[PDB]
Amino acid sequence: RASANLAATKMSECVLGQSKRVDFCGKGYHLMSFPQSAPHGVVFLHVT
Amino acid sequence: VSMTKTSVDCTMYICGDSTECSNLLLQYGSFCTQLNRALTGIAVEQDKNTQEVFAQVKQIYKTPPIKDFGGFNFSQILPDPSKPSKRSFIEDLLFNKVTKFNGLTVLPPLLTDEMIAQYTSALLAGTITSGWTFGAGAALQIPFAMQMAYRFNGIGVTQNVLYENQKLIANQFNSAIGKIQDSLSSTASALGKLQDVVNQNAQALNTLVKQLSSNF
Amino acid sequence: LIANQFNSAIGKIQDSLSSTASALGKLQDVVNQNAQALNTLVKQLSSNFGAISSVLNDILSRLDPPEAEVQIDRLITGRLQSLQTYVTQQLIRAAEIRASANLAATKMSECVLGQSKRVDFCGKGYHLMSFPQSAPHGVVFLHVTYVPAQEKNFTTAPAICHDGKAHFPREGVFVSNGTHWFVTQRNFYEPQIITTDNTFVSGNCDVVIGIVNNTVYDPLQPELDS
Amino acid sequence: NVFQTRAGCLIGAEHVNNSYECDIPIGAGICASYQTSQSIIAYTMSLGAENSVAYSNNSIAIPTNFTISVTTEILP
Numbered sequence A: 001r002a003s004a005n006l007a008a009t010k011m012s013e014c015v016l017g018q019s020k021r022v023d024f025c026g027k028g029y030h031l032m033s034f035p036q037s038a039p040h041g042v043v044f045l046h047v048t
Numbered sequence B: 001v002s003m004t005k006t007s008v009d010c011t012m013y014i015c016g017d018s019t020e021c022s023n024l025l026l027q028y029g030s031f032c033t034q035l036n037r038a039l040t041g042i043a044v045e046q047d048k049n050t051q052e053v054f055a056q057v058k059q060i061y062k063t064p065p066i067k068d069f070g071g072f073n074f075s076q077i078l079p080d081p082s083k084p085s086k087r088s089f090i091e092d093l094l095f096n097k098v099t100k101f102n103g104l105t106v107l108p109p110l111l112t113d114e115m116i117a118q119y120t121s122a123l124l125a126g127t128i129t130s131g132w133t134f135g136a137g138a139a140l141q142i143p144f145a146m147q148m149a150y151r152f153n154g155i156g157v158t159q160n161v162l163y164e165n166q167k168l169i170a171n172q173f174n175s176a177i178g179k180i181q182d183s184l185s186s187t188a189s190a191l192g193k194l195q196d197v198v199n200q201n202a203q204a205l206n207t208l209v210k211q212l213s214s215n216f
Numbered sequence C: 001l002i003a004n005q006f007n008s009a010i011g012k013i014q015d016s017l018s019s020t021a022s023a024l025g026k027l028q029d030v031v032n033q034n035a036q037a038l039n040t041l042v043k044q045l046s047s048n049f050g051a052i053s054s055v056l057n058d059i060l061s062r063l064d065p066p067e068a069e070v071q072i073d074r075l076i077t078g079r080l081q082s083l084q085t086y087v088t089q090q091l092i093r094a095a096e097i098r099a100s101a102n103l104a105a106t107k108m109s110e111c112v113l114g115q116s117k118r119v120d121f122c123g124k125g126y127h128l129m130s131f132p133q134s135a136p137h138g139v140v141f142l143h144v145t146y147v148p149a150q151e152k153n154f155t156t157a158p159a160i161c162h163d164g165k166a167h168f169p170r171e172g173v174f175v176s177n178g179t180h181w182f183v184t185q186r187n188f189y190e191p192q193i194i195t196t197d198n199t200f201v202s203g204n205c206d207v208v209i210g211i212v213n214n215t216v217y218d219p220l221q222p223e224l225d226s
Numbered sequence D: 001n002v003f004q005t006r007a008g009c010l011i012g013a014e015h016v017n018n019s020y021e022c023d024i025p026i027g028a029g030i031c032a033s034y035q036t037s038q039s040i041i042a043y044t045m046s047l048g049a050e051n052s053v054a055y056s057n058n059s060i061a062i063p064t065n066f067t068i069s070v071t072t073e074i075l076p
């Protein structure tokens, strides 16, 4: 559940917007992220 | 995000098909009614976990038939109509990596895998065509080439850097995505965080089954 | 207009709460789970666990000690295991509440005491402010957010050639209502005449993709001519 | 009145071609609800309104008006 809550946080603040949080959305200055599904999980592609 | 929605029954596990054993078990009060409640509570929130992550868009957006995104190439992450389950190319790579009679059953997830892919397409389709505007209110379209100019401002780089370097930036993005496909297609350990969850639940369940062979 | 919309938005909260009981489900479930867990513990006293009776005094009142000692041991083992089950359930459940309590403390700091740029952390929309309200065993936040409402289709351009040089907006985008070019903000259509004070120059016409032709009005020219 | 689903055999529910939001979850994408003489129905649940965006490389939609909304977030 803690991971599921973390995944929901990233979806909101990384896909739907743009983060100023350091290293929260990939190492570098964050531009955008794209979600991808996986078996029992989620995969984020972070563009920095 | 979630794990297997298992369900276990006492009356077939402790006293599987025996009248004498079943009558004795009733002398222990409501242990199984308490246990079957605990496992149900887990199973229900496993659907909540998926619901919170993916069901964040109320409308299913979809990209236009013309893919003129200023030079950027998303064909490796947008849906693939050639599959019966409309999953992208990279998603297909991810699914190809991650892999009884004693009252032990597995319940099916409420969101089927086809529905999960449909949510990620809407989240992805919104991002390219509307920026961050679809998150707050209604999706307001904006050219992708311009969308990056205001993503660059967000990190303190003046937007003229993007436009004067638009072909260079687009080519670097396309190659960066291509490397992801090469990474996944060869390195199995990339998905270890999800394989361990599957392995832990199967390993825990097999221990439960083996316990029936003990004399105690 | 803004003040009247705020006052009506607050009024709707009262109408929502006064009729929909399910609004407080997240707090009612916590109360129900603890009462339900505690009642199970009490019911366990009625079980025999293998002894001849669920009542402890009836064993003592009917058996002399060398026999009662075995019958009592069955009740102690069963009742002691019942407490361990209850306590374990509370330790896991208490950890779940703490995570919510830590989340509630985070929102209080970053939503009431300040203003968040985190998306959907403080309500859906562009966050303005939040107001805390207490509740039984919980906290209720009223999140005030800005949501864009009505939109128009404008033609746009990334830059403008005037004298061979590319002009870019300082803040906002270039838009056209079909015939004229203006510079305007992001989240509120407010056209402005393109001047030397709205834009900055970089390079020339030949490198940016999609540049258009217009004139950037220079406010200084009429002041020196007159 | 027997409807075969991927989660098991559902008896007593009237299978419907339409798609709605989930009311009582069953599994595998099937939900049931009590609505129109009235009876329990089963259907494939829907994810939301289908809505394409009018994308083009020289077209922007800019809001001209706004609304102030207040939402309620409840935490234990």
Ligand SMILES: *[C@@H]1O[C@H](CO)[C@@H](O[C@@H]2O[C@H](CO)[C@@H](O[C@@H]3O[C@H](CO[C@H]4O[C@H](CO)[C@@H](O)[C@H](O)[C@@H]4O)[C@@H](O)[C@H](O)[C@@H]3O)[C@H](O)[C@H]2NC(C)=O)[C@H](O)[C@H]1NC(C)=O
Pocket (backbone or CB within 6 Å): C001, C004, C005, D064, D065, D066, D067
């Ligand atoms: C941006 O959106 C706003 C609403 O989201 C717009 O404000 C609305 O503007 C219209 C037209 O000017 C008003 O409608 C008229 O209102 C008058 C008087 O209103 C009184 O009665 C209403 C109804 O009880 C009440 O809500 C008001 O507070 C007044 O007491 C009526 O006589 C007319 O028949 C007609 O209904 C709306 O009332 C007004 N809404 C609000 C909340 O103020 C605004 O015009 C939009 N701006 C732009 C540039 O488009």
Ligand SMILES: *[C@@H]1O[C@H](CO)[C@@H](O[C@@H]2O[C@H](CO)[C@@H](O[C@@H]3O[C@H](CO)[C@@H](O)[C@H](O)[C@@H]3O)[C@H](O)[C@H]2NC(C)=O)[C@H](O)[C@H]1NC(C)=O
Pocket (backbone or CB within 6 Å): C177, C178, C179, C180
């Ligand atoms: C796009 O915006 C421009 C800028 O406002 C519009 O041009 C303006 O159009 C109005 C309406 O025809 C003109 O108003 C007229 O002004 C004259 C005085 O010049 C007055 O005597 C008339 O009674 C009328 O009010 C306005 O002058 C004109 N501005 C300029 C600088 O020419 C244009 O019409 C808009 N186009 C669309 C499709 O909305």
Ligand SMILES: *[C@@H]1O[C@H](CO)[C@@H](O[C@@H]2O[C@H](CO)[C@@H](O[C@@H]3O[C@H](CO)[C@@H](O)[C@H](O)[C@@H]3O)[C@H](O)[C@H]2NC(C)=O)[C@H](O)[C@H]1NC(C)=O
Pocket (backbone or CB within 6 Å): C161, C211, C212, C213
């Ligand atoms: C914005 O305005 C500028 C200038 O008004 C336009 O540039 C002009 O483009 C035309 C044709 O593209 C040029 O004509 C060419 O002239 C050369 C000689 O210089 C001649 O050999 C060719 O056969 C042709 O006639 C014109 O010279 C050029 N003017 C300048 C000052 O560079 C520009 O095209 C406009 N923007 C758009 C998008 O049309």
Ligand SMILES: *[C@@H]1O[C@H](CO)[C@@H](O[C@@H]2O[C@H](CO)[C@@H](O)[C@H](O)[C@H]2NC(C)=O)[C@H](O)[C@H]1NC(C)=O
Pocket (backbone or CB within 6 Å): B073, B074, B075, B076
């Ligand atoms: C985006 O990348 C894909 C992946 O390479 C491109 O698809 C290739 O297209 C060329 C010509 O159309 C073919 O020769 C390749 O075989 C394709 N590769 C694959 C894996 O299908 C696609 O063309 C790119 N986007 C654009 C607009 O060119």
Ligand SMILES: *[C@@H]1O[C@H](CO)[C@@H](O[C@@H]2O[C@H](CO)[C@@H](O)[C@H](O)[C@H]2NC(C)=O)[C@H](O)[C@H]1NC(C)=O
Pocket (backbone or CB within 6 Å): B068, C209, C210, C211, D057, D058
């Ligand atoms: C925006 O995209 C459109 C896509 O049609 C571009 O229009 C085409 O542009 C090419 C060359 O750039 C021409 O050969 C075609 O004839 C155009 N098609 C039509 C229907 O006019 C348009 O150029 C793009 N915008 C910019 C600024 O390049």
Ligand SMILES: *[C@@H]1O[C@H](CO)[C@@H](O[C@@H]2O[C@H](CO)[C@@H](O)[C@H](O)[C@H]2NC(C)=O)[C@H](O)[C@H]1NC(C)=O
Pocket (backbone or CB within 6 Å): D015, D017
């Ligand atoms: C609603 O769904 C039912 C199936 O659940 C459809 O009935 C089928 O119709 C096809 C014709 O395309 C037949 O080949 C099948 O044999 C029918 N099913 C059965 C069980 O006989 C029905 O046509 C659908 N109606 C609408 C309006 O969508």
Ligand SMILES: *[C@@H]1O[C@H](CO)[C@@H](O[C@@H]2O[C@H](CO)[C@@H](O)[C@H](O)[C@H]2NC(C)=O)[C@H](O)[C@H]1NC(C)=O
Pocket (backbone or CB within 6 Å): C151, C152, C153, D052, D053, D054, D055, D061
């Ligand atoms: C902006 O323009 C687009 C296309 O010119 C509009 O989208 C069309 O809207 C009509 C009805 O409003 C639909 O019948 C079309 O199918 C839409 N086309 C596409 C490609 O989606 C859009 O509504 C306009 N925006 C506003 C705010 O009016």
